[PDB]
Amino acid sequence: RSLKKGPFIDLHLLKKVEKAVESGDKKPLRTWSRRSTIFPNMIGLTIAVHNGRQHVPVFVTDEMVGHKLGEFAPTRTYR
Amino acid sequence: AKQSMKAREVKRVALADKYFAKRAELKAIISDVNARWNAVLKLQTLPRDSSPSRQRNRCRQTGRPHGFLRKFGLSRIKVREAAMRGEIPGLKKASW
Amino acid sequence: GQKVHPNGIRLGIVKPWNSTWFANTKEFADNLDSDFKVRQYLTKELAKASVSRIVIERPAKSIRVTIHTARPGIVIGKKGEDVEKLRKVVADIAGVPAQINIAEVRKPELDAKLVADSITSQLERRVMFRRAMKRAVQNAMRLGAKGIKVEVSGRLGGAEIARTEWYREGRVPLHTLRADIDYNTSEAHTTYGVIGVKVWIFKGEI
Amino acid sequence: ARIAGINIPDHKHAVIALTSIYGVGKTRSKAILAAAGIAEDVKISELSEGQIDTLRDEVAKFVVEGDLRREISMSIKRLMDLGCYRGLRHRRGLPVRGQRTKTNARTRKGPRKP
Amino acid sequence: LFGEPDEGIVISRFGMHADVESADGDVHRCNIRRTIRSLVTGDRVVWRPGKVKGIVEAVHERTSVLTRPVKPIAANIDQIVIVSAILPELSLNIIDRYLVACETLQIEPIIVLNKIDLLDDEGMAFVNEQMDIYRNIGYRVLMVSSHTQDGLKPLEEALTGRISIFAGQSGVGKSSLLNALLGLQKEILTNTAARLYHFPHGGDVIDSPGVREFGLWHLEPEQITQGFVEFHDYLGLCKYRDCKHDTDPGCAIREAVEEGKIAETRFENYHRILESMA
Amino acid sequence: PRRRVIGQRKILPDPKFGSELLAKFVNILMVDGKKSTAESIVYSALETLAQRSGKSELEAFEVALENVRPTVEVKSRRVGGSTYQVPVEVRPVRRNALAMRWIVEAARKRGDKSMALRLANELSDAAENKGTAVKKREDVHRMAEANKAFA
RNA sequence: ACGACCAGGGCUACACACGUGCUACAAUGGCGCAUACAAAGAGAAGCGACCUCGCGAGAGCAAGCGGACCUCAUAAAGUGCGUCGUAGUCCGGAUUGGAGUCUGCAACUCGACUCCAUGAAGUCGGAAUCGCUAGUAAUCGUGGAUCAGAAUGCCACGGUG
RNA sequence: GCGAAGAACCUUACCUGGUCUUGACAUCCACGGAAGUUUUCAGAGAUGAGAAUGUGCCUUCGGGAACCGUGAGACAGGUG
């Protein structure tokens, strides 16, 4: 792997991860934002980033963490 | 091109005095160890659109974000297309 | 038209500079912007007073647009207004303050330009391009030239083509290149197809 | 020694004969081998094995051989286990150190196929 | 001309006209308008009477499954009968040419061996063996006599519900079988609008004698290949590009022939056809 | 060159022999476009040839090249599409050019270290007229003077 | 509205074929070391020394000098020795691993950098193209251009040939 | 290695989802914001919602110029 010194988060989205705390790991959240990065703080749910159409929930299996929500989540679709 | 691929770009600036604040080219003079001092590395309840990478280089004449060239304000079409006749204080192509 | 024309190579080589201002690189583009923002403007401004060539300088970087016009008189206009507004614009659109300079053409029939446009503004009236052309190309060979060629492309008579038909008249080259080849095009963009008008005037050779 | 880049990286220009001799890659395989100073312009089997095997041991404290290959496998796996894009591609059988799938994806998608 | 739009199937090409059997079944010799052109016998048409003469002003020629130069004759030909006898010389490439085409077109060949009766115990056998090559290759053989019009039921039943056609060479008793099938002779021959007939057990048949003494039609290379699917399998056999189905080291197709994994004829035919377009 | 026919160009030689023979030849290998380093591994060979010739490096070449060079050839240009087969005198610009090339073309990409050797091993053999290059002198002349039936 | 906005995805997918490239293969080649002659490109949001470090990435810091003022920025092939000994090699590098580093809002998809670990095919290219005849083939560096971010390419760049 | 001298999204148009529709842009007019400003919050953002500030000449601080859109047509729109 290789590090972008800075990873990321986003506030409306981060706010929502806390919403999936006080609303727990309920069911997947929807932001279209994928700029924010996967963490175990993203455990709080499994979280759905737009990938055109698809707001795909990302697993908060945090051997994927240096990995934004689009890493885990779909993007394109293909054979 | 169209009005729009050009037209898009004018509309982006407004919300900031009705709603927000001001911070324009000063948000990330913090975000390294310039010396990551998180201070404007942490908001997004507020619009997402806009970054200099979301910025592209619209041809002036067409709005063409791409095809674009750093020496004319245009995309290449209009570059060459302007370039050959002159009304310019010099140009040449004479085996070059 | 089709080709990288005769003017498939000619750029500034032995060509007097309409911008001629020694601006310099950093603003150069912008000198041109301004240049061609007054040119853009200028050609709109003396679009009846008959600018035949706008030249731009910025002497000491102070735009100085030089007009060759079919008639300076209309270009100066009654009581200097027509040049005034150019001062306004040009100062304020070339940035580098307007000097606006008026001169009287050599001959508009030696203008590729004039001739084409003329022929367009002839055509537009409901005259023929033949008439319109004819008359100009004639009276350009008459003396207003000693060659003159038109060499068109796009919808000719409204056909499913765009290949050379032309109206050379006199001694006109297109390939012995250090030729005074006043070259322009106009067109009646047509509400049938497109008519390209492309009008050269051979003013001689160099 | 063999130096856990399992073979006597000798004879050759000879540390570099462990780049690709696993574990000890290029770097470690040098730093091991010069932990007894054996030639690397020429051989490493030309000297006292026990000074090199201590290195074999020293490097039996580096990421090596089976375990590192295993590591490699494991780590690779890790990705998938979560599912990723590194995961995804690997789980797509698709390169996780890349090569176009429209075009000649072939070392990682067999050295050529229609 | 105009009339009243009505459906019909074009029973016959009336030369100048086309004769249309209506939806009802009523045959009308019809004109064929300057306006329409995609017409063939078999087309379901909008034809109109006059205000017999009809006029045709709509057609329905369904998708390709056979041509000459390269121009569909009809459609719903789900089977091509490649019918032969030896007149006036013959070759394995000629049946195969038709086979390759059947295979290309994805129209089923039922390979019919005429004159089976003509062919002696040795001859019939030889010919059957040859017929078998194709058969083995996948194209069933029906032994018929041209003349005796044998195996007529297996053929007929193959015809049921589908349209069939008669291919071959100089009145190789194709014409004879056709007569049997019809149960009315409508052709003999010995040494694209034409006419169509309808089968009772179901399905239809299309005929022309002109086709039958032979020349042949324009085509493309891939089709010949399509004519032989075993080559695809060989294409895979050497390289990720197998030379070109023909010799050169690592030509699997060629190898498969060398082996005899493919029959030779397929390759041979591949060539007669290949050359002709070129 | 149908109008006015030709040999080689921008060649570079030796600062110690000045030999063109050696020049067009040292060069040949280039398609490395730089005999600023080409020349070197041939000398080891021509050195071993120098010895083998009983001469110098220069004249190590010489011997082997004079074996190599053709004295006749058969030439083609295809007059009319015609199969020329008549015996002809190999032109010098070819003699040399082709010959020089032939020696060089006989020590190629190989199987062990150092061309020095590879060349050395080609070189004396061409010296002895049983090199590949010399055998092209001794094969082209065999086709010559035995066929002249066709135009 | 196709106008048109945005979000986010999409090229670039993948059995793939193909072109059109890129790259190996090596032998002086890979490999270690030693070691000169290029030129041409680029600067003030500038270029950017020093400086500083980082193998590097990077990272920290930073003069000169709008350029024959400084600096980006510098040829390398060249050249002086070993090594290895066309070994899938030090070839060769796919592949991957594993992590640094980078750019871009963020690259996570569809962004860029080092180390480390890993090191296919490839060994000279079947069938099968063109090119080319000199500064071409062909080759060494070199560079620009503009892209927010990317030059297998283009656009450039001079050496050697 | 075809038009990006850049396709992450953006760009972007196009998927695909989400927007808008006198239209995204336009133009005047009204109109409001003069102009224009100061700042908060929330939404994927589209945008949605807050508070702040200043308006200079003429002057419905609207207007006019501000300068924008709206709104609305007139008008505006298209690389549709």
Task: Give chain D positions within 8 Å (CB) of E236.
Answer: 114
Which residues make Cβ contacts (< 8 Å) with residue E140, sequence separation at least 6? E109, E110, E111
| Domain count across chain B | 1
Contact D113 E236 (CB under 8 A): no
What three-state secondary structure class fits A68?
Answer: strand
Residue B37 belongs to what domain range? 1-86
Tell me which chains share at least 3 CB pairs under 8 Å with chain B: A, C
Single-letter amino acid, residue F14: D
As ranges, strand G nucleotides with an atom below 7 A of a protein CB are 3-19, 21, 26-32, 43-45, 58-61, 66, 77-79, 82-87, 89-124, 126-127, 133-140, 145-149, 159-161
Task: Give chain B positions within 8 Å (CB) of A10.
Answer: 44, 48
Contact C12 B92 (CB under 8 A): yes
Give domain status of residue B52, yes or no: yes
| Pick from F26, F8, F29: nearest CA to F65 | F26
Task: Give chain B positions within 8 Å (CB) of A12.
Answer: 44-46
| Pick from E10, E2, E31, E39: nearest CA to E204 | E10
Give domain status of residue B47, yes or no: yes
Residue B4: which nucleotide is closest by CA–C1'? H25
Residue B4 CB lies within 7 Å of the nucleic strand H: yes
Whether a cis peptide bond, with omega within 30° of 0, leads into E88 is yes
Contact A6 B36 (CB under 8 A): yes
Give the sign of the dihedral formed by CA F16, CA F22, CA F24, CA F29: negative
Give domain status of residue B96, yes or no: no
* Residue C86 burial class via C-beta count within 10 angstroms: exposed 0-12, middle 13-18, buried 19 and up: buried
CA distance C18 to C38: 12
Single-letter amino acid, residue B42: K
Contact A33 B44 (CB under 8 A): yes
CA–CA distance from D76 to each of A4, D89, F41 (Å)?
20, 10, 48
Give me the CA B30–C1' H20 separation in Å, rounded.
Answer: 37
Resolution in A: 9.8
Going along chain D, which residue ranges are E strands? none
CA distance D31 to D106: 34
Sheet with C147-150: list strands edge to edge.
C169-170, C147-150, C199-205, C179-183
Q: Does B51 touch chain A (CB under 8 A)?
A: no
| Pick from C116, C115, C112: nearest CA to C183 | C112
Q: What are phi and psi of C170, to 5 degrees?
A: 85, -145
Task: Give chain B positions within 8 Å (CB) of C7.
Answer: 84-85
Domains of chain C and any CATH numbers? 16-106 (3.30.300.20), 107-206 (3.30.1140.32)
Give me the CA C171–C1' G79 separation in Å, rounded.
Answer: 63
Chain A touches chain F, with at least 3 Cβ pairs below 8 Å, answer no
Contact C32 B88 (CB under 8 A): yes
Name C58's bridge partners: none
Q: Secondary structure of chain E in the HEC alphabet?
A: CCCCCEEEEEEECCCCCEEEEECCCCEEEECCCCCCCCCCCCCEEEEEECCCCEEEEECCCCCCCCECCCCECCCCECEEEEEECCCCCCCHHHHHHHHHHHHHHCCEEEEEECCCCCCCHHHHHHHHHHHHHHHHCCCCEEECCCCCCCCHHHHHHHHCCCEEEEECCCCCCHHHHHHHHHCCCCCCCCCCCCEEEECCCCCEEEECHHHHCCCCCCCCHHHHHHCCCHHHHHHHHCCCCCCCCCCCCCCHHHHHHHHCCCCHHHHHHHHHHHHHHC
Contact D86 A63 (CB under 8 A): no
Residue A51: which nucleotide is closest by CA–C1'? G9
B31, B45, B48 member nearest A15 (Cβ): B45
Give domain status of residue B93, yes or no: no
Q: Taking phi first (over 0 means left), then psi (-120 to 50 degrees means alpha), and beta for anything else, what does residue E151 get?
A: left
What is the DSSP code string of C112-175? HHHHHHHHHHHHTTT--HHHHHHHHHHHHHSSS-SEEEEB--S-SSS-S-----B--EES--SS
Single-letter amino acid, residue F29: L
